Design a protein around this ligand. Structure first.
Ligand SMILES: CCCCCCCCCCCCCCCCCC(=O)OC[C@H](COP(=O)([O-])OCC(O)COP(=O)([O-])OC[C@@H](COC(=O)CCCCCCCCCCCCCCCCC)OC(=O)CCCCCCCCCCCCCCCCC)OC(=O)CCCCCCCCCCCCCCCCC
Ligand SMILES: CCCCCCCCCCCCCCCCCC(=O)OC[C@H](COP(=O)([O-])OCC[N+](C)(C)C)OC(=O)CCCCCCCCCCCCCCCCC
Ligand SMILES: CCCCCCCCCCCCCCCCCC(=O)OC[C@H](COP(=O)(O)OCCN)OC(=O)CCCCCCCCCCCCCCCCC
Ligand SMILES: CCCCCCCCCCCCCCCCCC(=O)OC[C@H](COP(=O)(O)OCCN)OC(=O)CCCCCCCCCCCCCCCCC
Ligand SMILES: CCCCCCCCCCCCCCCCCC(=O)OC[C@H](COP(=O)(O)OCCN)OC(=O)CCCCCCCCCCCCCCCCC
Ligand SMILES: CCCCCCCCCCCCO[C@@H]1O[C@H](CO)[C@@H](O[C@H]2O[C@H](CO)[C@@H](O)[C@H](O)[C@H]2O)[C@H](O)[C@H]1O
Ligand code: SF4
Ligand code: SF4
Ligand code: SF4
Lengths: 378, 309, 176, 56, 69, 144, 154
């Protein structure tokens, strides 16, 4: 038993017998930054930017999950236009994540070219982030109550122009990998997980669907306007790395299908709840109306109070079920905020999934779980 | 006059290797929708010089080596052997005209594995020695097919003289009667030089002056394999009164084969170690043995046995 | 609604079996992959010639901070400390007193740019458009201390960048 | 968009796709970087009567 | 554009062209403007040694025709 | 078209005013494209556009060789772009300052400065507030 | 004797800044923007900056993300193993001074407590262009070195 001591940074303590992996012991905490404790010293608005920085590949999806939880405790709802923007940018965020997941998974096992092609596509999607929020990544754009600002004029046309060509970029990626015998040798029958083991080990997202489980929170527990768009849920059959890769590629195509509907069905109206005890008033109103200035002053200093209570809220994030257990004590700062990161349970399953495989397969299995250590360590 | 001739081989080889590093970075760049080096000199033409100077004035960090003698031997062996592989190459005239030139090249390349072995012994580390032993096991395995494929081809040539391959391909390239062997020959060179998708020393390890010398040796070998592939399978017609016409056509084929190494590196993922061993022992070797049998029989049954000389 | 990504039975007739045999022995899918990277070789690259060319940005871009003035030259900041209260990173430190003319003005206005998360919450909170994130993003330094901005530094940034900052605010204030 | 006809044919054939119809580089199809000013709508609570906060 | 890769390819091409061109030219210069004699077998070596004696100047590449008859 | 491609390459030498001007932009900017001169700022930077080029390469600047007393023939820096052209160069707007000049203010810097880090002009932080506790000063006349 | 030394500094300075091989500590978010600077739009390789190099061949360490207390000893170990000349670029607020986690019990308040830093790139994250500006600034810093001039005045 040869012992070896070695997204973020990971420490793998492994035991090998020849080529085989007897035990994988992930040692994490290398990016633990006490986010959950820091949030207890923030107002609800001040805590929002911490959620950009968990799964820092799916920023607005994390924002959405936190906003929905706070909206639930506030007993308000965001306006319909904000909900459509949140689904629109939620799916753009899904594309950002699967590009990162699929091409870096490919790059880690030597297939480096698709990374460069598809990161030019990510670069254009960062522009959409920056045009609505002024930041390429940590937008802090989706907030409890809706979104911070309305889409700039001309943005939806440019998203249409981008989406019209994307599936061809997916086709090119498939031409590199899908039928490649070398790619299939690295993924087929690697890291098989049974449907029953997947549920008991706490897996979610593609880690469940690759094994045939028919589960997607956007279909079964829909949020915002996901019940108003049409899409299919990709389902695997072998529960291995290859089927999960195919599930991710097909999910990108379905995201384009959703994005197309969001662009066409985008309604008019306001974009944050018309309730100035939760969402700040417009700047022009703040500068003319006494009530607006008082509410602006209080929302940016004390923040809004949230009725006491606890909620577990979850979304189908690109990496799987992402949730928060959010406890309010009635004040304007959360009492406790436990973040449920899907990668946490997935990485805990690495030892189980690596059994009977070789050292290089551990690289494929970590890649097929889509691990970002910002969400794993928090 | 001969010492002039030696230098007209050695110095250009090292120059070609230097600028292969530029060509590799730019070809890979453009296949990746980017440009690669284009700032350091016009079109990056000074990038190899900057890299070479930078490497040679870098701090030479020697960890506690187990054997000082073997720490110096391995790069000297690697570079000296790489340069030696070129002296029988007919371009169209060899520097040394060897009766058994093909065997000499076979004999010399089989010693190239010692520099891997000695560098693991010199690394003073258990994990580096283990990585070196995996590389050796890969290298010697693909030596098996290369030697058998080479023998199969020479049954059509009739000689171990490299310049006879030119005569053999006067009417037609050997790739036509022997493309199944050319296919496995070409893949074998990639795995032999530990090139992608067989770059497992880099892949497995991922999970100054002396470094540069090992790199130059490796890249000198990559060009030489592809020169050898061009002579073996894409023979250039030689006109004795205009030998430079051979050299130009010869050079173009060699450059194109060398860039196909680059093209391949940009296109595929990496093999698993056991998977590239299976590729050799369970796929190439069975088929090379059958084709060796076939190529022994074919000249006899067609009445196409080549002349001894 | 769902679909199967990989639920197919290969045809076992002789023509289909020979097609798979030809692919295995003649490496056809691998040759097809080489066609794709070859096609990219002859595509115009996506690289821009930085710093002679720049990546596109919008008026909302959150960059280096700056303190602004009214057209008269009076400071806009009135030391309300709303920016300091909202700052998620506690990157703002403010002190104030009545100025010699009786005006409500700051005597300290520091932003620790290495605490700051460039979230833009301060420019949303400001009631008078005094603190903004400007369009500059090329201000890296050789020392840590150079990134601990005091009021003088921030006012100079305002005087340095106001021409662009005023134009950007003009383009986006109707969205605020 | 400036590739010669021979090069366009070569890369289309090598990829097996008509790449010119879906270029990954952007040209004039994108929206102007100066836009007319917006006039954003107001929400349902922007009313002068029948709008007491205790009802919403 | 892709043709900006050619300069580096051109430098490599010229570098790989020099050894073959130089070897050929050095052979002609050293062998009276002819190809270097190839002697792989004893018969060829014997003729070359005979030619060196016949030349009268101890050079195998200096030929003698019917003017010595 | 192989001939037409070479003609355009030759036209770029003429477009940059001869071989010397062609080689100067090649070695300063690693790019020999000829564009339309949009304008020039007071520091000597020149601004070009070519809308046949793809988004991102359709606008560029050729930096001056001398700015605020610094030799910038080889040492160009992104911070050398003054704010009024910065908006146009980064495509925050479509209007160059020649067409839509910035609003004039008396306190706006007349002279732009580039990044001064690592020079004697670098910023050095300090506390901008005055001393808070005043010490008692003993009398200067003895009377113990 | 003095003209020669100045020219030899220029040569070695040119070679080192023209051939800057980075080791990236992709610790967190900022590593994503580093990947974008490698991606085609910016293509750091076109400046002579190789996409990835092992520490033993590295000239510059880019600290791209939050440095936790748990990770600090490992980051110092990698830095000590770099052959010289070696430079450190601190990228983003976390590495600069702790950023948004500055008050955390588990976070190093700036990577310059562990290693000497040559360049600080502000932002959360800095844009890929902002990182590239930082890298070019480091190149200018190397260009100002006068190692042989100081050596011969010793
Ligand atoms: C292979 C070698 C082919 C040589 C032909 C070069 C050429 O003309 O290509 C450009 C030309 C334009 O291509 P493009 O992609 O459409 O360009 C986009 C714009 O149209 C282009 O329009 P533009 O507006 O951008 O044009 C402006 C451009 C002007 O563009 C040009 O004029 C390109 C000039 C290239 C001439 C090189 C001739 C080859 C010399 C051989 C030496 C290298 C090999 C050894 O100005 C420049 O930038 C010129 C600066 C100098 C560039 C440096 C080139 C020197 C190379 C030689 C190194 C010597 C040292 O190509 C063609 O028109 C197609 C026919 C050319 C033959 C193609 C054969 C492809 C290879 C077969 C497949 C095998 C793959 C495996
Ligand atoms: C073997 C000898 C190799 C000699 C290499 C010659 C170096 C050429 C060179 O310096 O590049 C031009 C460079 C060009 O300057 P640069 O490197 O600052 O580049 C400026 C242009 N941009 C902005 C695009 C980067 O000249 C110099 O910088 C001065 C260094 C001279 C070193 C030569 C000493 C002899
Ligand atoms: C599918 C992907 C395959 C990837 C594998 C890599 C392939 C690389 C192929 C490299 C060889 C390409 C050949 C390029 C031709 C060289 C240029 C030239 O001028 O050669 C002319 C030659 C005809 O002349 P010649 O070779 O002398 O044949 C006479 C018989 N001895 O040739 C005339 O056509
Ligand atoms: C038309 C006329 C032609 C008829 C030919 C029929 C030959 C059929 C042989 C196929 C037998 C077979 O099924 O072999 C496969 C099996 C080894 O398979 P393996 O990869 O180790 O693991 C399988 C699990 N996936 O079983 C084996 O162990 C492989 C068989 C042993 C290896 C034989 C190697 C042949 C010798 C190599 C040289 C070629 C022949 C002489 C030259
Ligand atoms: C008339 C009677 C005549 C008698 C003689 C008749 C013989 C002719 C018919 C037989 C033809 C034999 C073909 C020889 C090529 C070798 C075939 C081969 O071994 O491929 C199979 C190998 C493994 O295939 P796999 O699908 O993974 O699994 C099968 C094993 N269980 O798969 C591989 O090897 C994959 C290749 C790995 C390398 C990938 C990287 C490069 C690929 C592109 C290279 C382009 C081609 C290069 C050409 C070079 C030219 C110099
Ligand atoms: C191939 C042709 C090259 C022609 C150019 C010839 C120029 C000769 C002058 C070389 C100058 C080398 O410059 C010097 O290199 C060594 C690396 O070995 C660096 O490193 C050295 O200095 C540091 C301290 O400064 C030491 O801790 C370190 O152990 C030591 O190796 C120096 O930081 C650098 O100042
Ligand atoms: S941008 Fe955010 S973190 Fe930075 S000073 Fe403003 S409010 Fe604070
Ligand atoms: S900058 Fe604005 S928010 Fe901050 S103290 Fe001054 S006036 Fe108040
Ligand atoms: S500086 Fe900002 S973007 Fe970078 S790692 Fe820290 S939180 Fe993430």
């Amino acid at each position: 038993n040869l012992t070896l001591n070695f997204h973020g940074v990971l420490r793998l303590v492994m035991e090998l017998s020849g080529e085989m992996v007897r035990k994988c012991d992930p040692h994490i905490g290398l990016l633990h930054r006490g986010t959950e404790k820091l949030i207890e010293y923030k107002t609800y608005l001040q805590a929002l930017p911490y959620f950009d920085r968990l799964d820092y590949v799916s920023m607005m999806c994390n924002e959405q999950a936190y906003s929905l939880a706070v909206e639930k405790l506030l007993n308000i709802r965001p306006p319909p236009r904000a909900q459509w923007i949140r689904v629109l940018f939620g799916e753009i965020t899904r594309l950002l994540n699967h590009i990162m997941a699929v091409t870096t998974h490919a790059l880690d096992i030597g297939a480096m070219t698709p990374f460069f092609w598809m990161f030019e596509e990510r670069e254009k999607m960062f522009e959409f982030y920056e045009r609505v929020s002024g930041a390429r990544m940590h937008a802090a754009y989706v907030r409890p109550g809706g979104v911070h600002q309305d889409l700039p004029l001309g943005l939806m046309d440019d998203i249409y122009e981008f989406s019209k060509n994307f599936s061809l970029r997916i086709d090119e990626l498939e031409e590199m990998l899908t039928n490649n015998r070398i790619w299939r040798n690295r993924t087929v029958d690697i890291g098989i997980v049974t449907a029953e083991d997947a549920l008991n080990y706490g897996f979610s997202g593609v880690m469940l669907r690759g094994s045939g489980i028919q589960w997607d929170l956007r279909k079964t527990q829909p949020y915002d306007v996901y019940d108003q768009v049409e899409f299919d849920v990709p389902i695997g059959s072998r529960g291995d790395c290859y089927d999960r890769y195919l599930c991710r590629v097909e999910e990108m195509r379905q995201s384009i299908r959703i994005i197309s509907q969001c662009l066409n069905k985008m309604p008019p109206g306001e974009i944050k709840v018309d309730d100035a005890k939760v969402s700040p008033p417009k700047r022009a109103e703040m500068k003319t109306s006494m009530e607006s200035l008082i509410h602006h002053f209080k929302l940016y200093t004390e923040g809004y109070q949230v009725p006491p209570g606890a909620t577990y809220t979850a979304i189908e994030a690109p990496k799987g079920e992402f949730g928060v257990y959010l406890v309010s004590d009635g004040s304007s700062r959360p009492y406790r905020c436990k973040i449920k990161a899907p990668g946490f349970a997935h990485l805990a399953g690495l030892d189980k999934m690596s059994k009977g495989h070789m050292l290089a397969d551990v690289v494929a299995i970590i890649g097929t779980q889509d691990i970002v250590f910002g969400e794993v360590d928090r | 006059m001969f010492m002039i001739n030696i230098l007209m081989l050695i110095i250009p080889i090292l120059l070609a290797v230097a600028f292969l590093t530029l060509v590799e970075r730019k070809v890979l760049g453009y296949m990746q929708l980017r440009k690669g080096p284009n700032v350091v000199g016009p079109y990056g033409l000074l990038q190899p010089i900057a890299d070479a100077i930078k490497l040679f004035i870098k701090e030479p960090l020697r960890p506690a080596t187990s054997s000082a003698s073997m720490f110096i031997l391995a790069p000297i062996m690697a570079l000296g052997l790489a340069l030696t592989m070129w002296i029988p190459l007919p371009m169209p005239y060899p520097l040394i005209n060897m009766n058994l030139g093909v065997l000499f090249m076979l004999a010399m390349s089989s010693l190239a594995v010692y520099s891997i072995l000695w560098s693991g012994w010199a690394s003073n580390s258990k994990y580096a020695l283990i990585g070196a032993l995996r590389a050796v096991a890969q290298t010697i395995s693909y030596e098996v097919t290369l030697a058998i494929i080479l023998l199969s081809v020479l049954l059509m040539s009739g000689s171990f003289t490299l310049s006879t391959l030119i005569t053999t391909q006067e009417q037609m390239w050997l790739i036509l009667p022997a493309w199944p062997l050319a296919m496995m020959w070409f893949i074998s060179t990639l795995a032999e030089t530990n090139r992608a998708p067989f770059d497992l020393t880099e892949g497995e390890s991922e999970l100054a002056g002396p470094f540069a010398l090992f790199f130059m040796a490796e890249y000198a070998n990559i060009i030489m394999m592809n020169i050898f592939t061009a002579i073996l399978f894409l023979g250039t017609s030689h006109n004795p009164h205009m030998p430079e016409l051979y050299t130009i056509n010869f050079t173009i084929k060699s450059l194109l084969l060398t860039m196909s190494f680059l093209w391949i590196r940009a296109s595929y993922p990496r093999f698993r170690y056991d998977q590239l061993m299976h590729l050799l022992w369970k796929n190439f070797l069975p088929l090379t043995l059958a084709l060796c049998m076939w190529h022994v029989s074919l000249p006899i049954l067609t009445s196409g046995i080549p002349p001894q000389t | 609604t769902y679909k199967y990504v990989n639920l197919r039975e290969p045809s076992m007739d002789m023509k289909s079996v020979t097609d798979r045999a030809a692919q295995t022995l003649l490496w056809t899918e691998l040759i097809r992959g080489l066609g794709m990277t070859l096609s990219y070789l002859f595509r115009e690259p996506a690289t821009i010639n930085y710093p002679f060319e720049k990546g596109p940005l919008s008026p909302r871009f959150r960059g280096e901070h700056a303190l602004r003035r009214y057209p008269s030259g009076e400071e806009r900041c009135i030391a309300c400390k709303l920016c300091e209260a909202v700052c998620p990173a506690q990157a703002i430190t403010i002190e104030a007193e009545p100025r010699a003319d009786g005006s409500r003005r700051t005597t300290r206005y520091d932003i620790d740019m290495t605490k700051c998360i460039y979230c833009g919450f301060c420019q949303e909170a400001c009631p008078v458009d005094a603190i903004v994130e400007g369009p500059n993003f090329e201000f890296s330094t050789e020392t840590h201390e150079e990134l601990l901005y005091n009021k003088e530094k921030l006012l100079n940034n305002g005087d340095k960048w106001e021409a662009e900052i005023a134009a950007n605010i003009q383009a986006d204030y109707l969205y605020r | 968009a400036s590739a010669t006809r021979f090069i366009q044919w070569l890369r289309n054939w090598a990829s097996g796709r008509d790449l010119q119809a879906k270029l990954q580089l952007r040209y004039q199809e994108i929206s102007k970087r100066t836009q007319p000013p917006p006039k954003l709508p107001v929400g349902p609570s922007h009313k002068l009567s029948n709008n007491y906060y205790c009802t919403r | 554009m892709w043709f900006e890769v050619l300069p580096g390819i051109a430098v490599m091409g010229v570098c790989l062209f020099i050894p073959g061109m130089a070897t050929a030219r050095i052979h002609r210069f050293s062998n009276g403007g002819k190809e270097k004699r190839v002697a792989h077998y004893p018969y060829q070596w014997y003729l070359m040694e005979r030619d060196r004696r016949v030349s009268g100047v101890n050079r195998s590449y200096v030929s003698k025709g019917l003017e010595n008859i | 078209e192989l001939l037409q491609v070479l003609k355009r390459g030759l036209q770029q030498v003429s477009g940059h005013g001869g071989l010397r001007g062609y080689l100067r932009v090649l070695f300063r900017a690693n790019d020999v494209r000829v564009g339309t001169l949009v304008g020039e700022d007071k520091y000597g930077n020149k601004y070009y556009e070519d809308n046949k080029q793809f988004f991102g390469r359709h606008r560029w600047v050729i930096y001056t060789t001398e700015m605020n007393g610094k030799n910038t023939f080889w040492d160009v820096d992104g911070s050398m772009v003054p704010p009024e052209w910065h908006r146009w160069l980064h495509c925050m707007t479509d209007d160059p300052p020649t067409v839509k000049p910035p609003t004039a203010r008396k306190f706006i810097w007349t002279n732009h400065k580039f990044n001064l880090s690592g020079t004697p002009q670098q910023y050095v932080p300090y506390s901008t507030t005055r001393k808070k506790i005043q010490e008692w000063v003993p009398p200067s006349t003895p009377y113990k | 004797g003095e003209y020669v030394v100045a020219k030899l500094d220029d040569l070695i300075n040119w070679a080192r800044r023209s051939s800057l091989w980075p080791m990236t500590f992709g610790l967190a978010c900022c590593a994503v923007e580093m990947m974008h600077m490698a991606a085609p739009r910016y293509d750091m390789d076109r400046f002579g900056v190789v996409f990835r190099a092992s520490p033993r061949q590295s000239d510059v360490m880019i600290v791209a993300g939050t440095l936790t207390n748990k990770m600090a000893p490992a980051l110092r170990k990698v830095y000590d193993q770099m052959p010289e000349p070696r430079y450190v670029v601190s990228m983003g607020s976390c590495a600069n001074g702790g950023g948004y986690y500055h008050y955390s019990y588990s976070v190093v308040r700036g990577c310059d407590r562990i290693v000497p830093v040559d360049i600080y790139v502000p932002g959360c994250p800095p844009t890929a262009e902002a990182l590239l500006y930082g890298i070019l600034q480091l190149q200018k810093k190397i260009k100002r070195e006068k190692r042989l001039r100081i050596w011969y005045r010793r």
